[PDB]
């Protein structure tokens, strides 16, 4: 189980100030300054305010950042520019910066040393040591992050650990000139991490499969599917293997 924040600072010039957000996920799950994972409501006001205040403080802080980087990049006060950050811990600690899509700054395996991606972040790195944020950080991560992280589940290990198993079935679709395209399916399962793979006589089939990015449904559950194009009459040679965590044993189907 883990807790991560995903920060977003996007300068849309002429269009006001930068749109900034802060999001939380215990694991792949959203939760938060109106919180959006119900069980979190179990926290009061004087939580939500020391908190929101924070966003305002960063909204304000990145505002500088957003700018200082044009600085560092010779850039312009022209187009948009986006800064993202991922700060969070497991129970590996995250503090990851990207700017515009490209990697920027990062905290390495033993959080005490960074890694920049270019002359830029390079002269953001060299400062943070002249300001030891390596440690200003080390703590939080090891420190309070975990405290919140654990001090969180408790308010929802009810769903923050639930696990509705996936429900497969395989379809049969004709392909011109004697070929049929089998489609194993995978509905209503959570978490979204699943693994659907076809097999022809026990051989994996990761050469001509056609998986679909595991898509969400609208009710926590997820759906996904893997497709194979098999010659006519010769289906029962090809089997589908579903492996999801809330599954005593991985499934297996033939249609």
């Amino acid at each position: 189980h883990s807790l991560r924040y995903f920060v977003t600072a996007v300068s849309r010039p002429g269009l006001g100030e930068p749109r900034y957000m802060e999001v939380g996920y215990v694991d792949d799950t959203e939760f938060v300054y109106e919180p959006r994972a119900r069980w979190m409501e179990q926290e009061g006001p004087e939580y939500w305010e020391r908190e929101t205040q924070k966003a305002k403080g960063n909204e304000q802080s990145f505002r500088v950042d957003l700018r200082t980087l044009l600085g560092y990049y010779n850039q312009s006060k022209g187009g948009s520019h986006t800064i993202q950050v991922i700060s969070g811990c497991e129970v590996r600690g995250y503090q990851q910066y990207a700017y515009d899509g490209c990697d920027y700054i990062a905290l390495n395996e033993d959080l005490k040393t960074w890694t920049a991606a270019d002359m830029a972040a390079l002269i953001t790195k060299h400062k943070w040591e002249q300001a030891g944020e390596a440690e200003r950080l080390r703590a939080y991560l090891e420190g309070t992050c975990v405290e919140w992280l654990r001090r969180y589940l408790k308010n929802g290990n009810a769903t923050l650990l639930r696990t509705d198993s996936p429900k497969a079935h395989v379809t049969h679709h004709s392909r011109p000139e004697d070929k049929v395209t089998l489609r194993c399916w995978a509905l209503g399962f959570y978490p979204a991490d699943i693994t659907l793979t076809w097999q022809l006589n026990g051989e994996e089939l990761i050469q001509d499969m056609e998986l679909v990015e595991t898509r969400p449904a609208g009710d926590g559950t997820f759906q996904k599917w893997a497709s194979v194009v098999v010659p006519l009459g010769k289906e029962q040679y090809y089997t589908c293997h579903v492996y999801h965590q809330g599954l005593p044993e991985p499934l297996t189907l033939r249609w």
Partner: peptide, 8 residues
């Protein structure tokens, strides 16, 4: 429950 980052 976020952290506070030192301007770049």
């Amino acid at each position: 429950s976020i952290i506070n980052f030192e301007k770049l």
